[PDB]
Amino acid sequence: SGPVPSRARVYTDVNTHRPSEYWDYESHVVEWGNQDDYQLVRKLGRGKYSEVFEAINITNNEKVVVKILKPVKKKKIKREIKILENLRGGPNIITLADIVKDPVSRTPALVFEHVNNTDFKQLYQTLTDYDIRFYMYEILKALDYCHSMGIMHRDVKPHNVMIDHEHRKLRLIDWGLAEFYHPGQEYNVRVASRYFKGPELLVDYQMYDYSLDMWSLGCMLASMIFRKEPFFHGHDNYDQLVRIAKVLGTEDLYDYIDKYNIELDPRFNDILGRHSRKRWERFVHSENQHLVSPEALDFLDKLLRYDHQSRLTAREAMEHPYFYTVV
Numbered sequence: 001s002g003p004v005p006s007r008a009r010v011y012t013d014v015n016t017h018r019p020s021e022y023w024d025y026e027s028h029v030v031e032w033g034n035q036d037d038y039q040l041v042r043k044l045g046r047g048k049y050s051e052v053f054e055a056i057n058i059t060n061n062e063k064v065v066v067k068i069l070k071p072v073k074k075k076k077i078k079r080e081i082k083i084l085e086n087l088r089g090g091p092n093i094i095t096l097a098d099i100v101k102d103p104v105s106r107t108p109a110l111v112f113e114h115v116n117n118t119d120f121k122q123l124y125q126t127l128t129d130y131d132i133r134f135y136m137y138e139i140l141k142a143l144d145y146c147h148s149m150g151i152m153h154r155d156v157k158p159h160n161v162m163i164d165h166e167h168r169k170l171r172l173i174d175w176g177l178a179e180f181y182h183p184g185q186e187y188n189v190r191v192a193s194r195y196f197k198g199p200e201l202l203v204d205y206q207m208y209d210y211s212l213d214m215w216s217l218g219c220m221l222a223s224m225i226f227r228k229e230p231f232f233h234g235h236d237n238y239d240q241l242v243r244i245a246k247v248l249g250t251e252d253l254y255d256y257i258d259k260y261n262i263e264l265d266p267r268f269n270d271i272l273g274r275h276s277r278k279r280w281e282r283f284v285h286s287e288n289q290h291l292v293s294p295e296a297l298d299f300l301d302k303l304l305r306y307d308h309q310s311r312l313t314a315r316e317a318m319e320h321p322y323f324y325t326v327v
């Protein structure tokens with residue numbers, strides 16, 4: 001009678017028990033300020049529906065970040081704006097300072113606090129085992145916060161984590177794919193970046209929850225501790241599940257799809273194969289061994305599980321012995 005329903009093991013009805021205004025972003029009233037108070041400095045990057053600039057607020061000589069949005073779907077702009085306002089001031093969540101539009105073109109822009117992002121290319125060698133545990137803890141603070149607030153990020157990846165290592169400051173950014181969690185809601189599976197997509201998205205299991213961000217965090221941790229970027233290198237979305245299966249094995253993949261009554265796409269039939277469950281220690285080499293520990297492996301093992309319900313929650317994760325050395 002179709003796939004088996006599922007709901008989050010934590011913060012299940014946080015939106016159900018709150019007023020409609022908190023989660024109804026379509027009904028959210030946005031009030032734009034004037035862009036003229038901002039001075040664009042330099043291009044920091046470019047997304048598919050966004051253009052990110054470094055800027056200065058002329059009124060106080062403060063460095064800000066300006067994200068110009070292509071109005072592809074106003075509903076998505078309203079969703080990002082609503083979520084950013086709801087999470088404002090949360091631990092390690094990018095702060096939305098203002099919302100403005102350019103008078104002439106009317107293109108919407110989000111103004112954020114500034115993060116002085118440390119040279120990551122040069123950073124990949126100076127980070128230690130302590131650094132990884134410390135920064136992992138900080139991302140979990142952000143996730144436990146947005147999950148307690150009924151939001152799932154749905155795009156956790158290195159690119160969306162800004163680190164100012166001189167000041168040990170971490171910010172989770174790009175809430176453009178974030179969504180409000182409503183138990184029983186079927187979500188679009190075309191979220192997150194390929195390398196970070198949870199098995200639920202790949203097998204087309206639409207009733208996912210906050211545990212999706214927990215899979216993405218595992219992908220990130222495995223790439224950090226094992227210095228293998230990305231950890232699951234799929235070449236398409238169908239191949240992505242095969243890359244996971246080569247590590248987690250096909251046995252538990254059927255245990256998963258059977259548990260939730262999932263219909264595997266017939267495109268997998270020829271490519272999936274049969275794979276044994278691998279051991280995390282196999283990924284330890286001379287290059288990475290200085291960042292790998294038993295605690296790190298036990299933690300990793302508990303995040304990268306097929307079954308979204310078996311994954312640690314951000315709270316459970318914060319308690320794990322992997323984090324005993326950090327405040």
Ligand SMILES: NC(=O)CCNCc1ccc(-c2ccccc2)c(Cl)c1
Binds near residue numbers: 133162
């Ligand atoms: N948009 C950008 O260019 C920012 C790119 N983000 C840099 C970055 C550097 C280090 C980490 C990290 C991950 C795990 C443990 C400790 C540190 C992350 Cl998640 C991200």
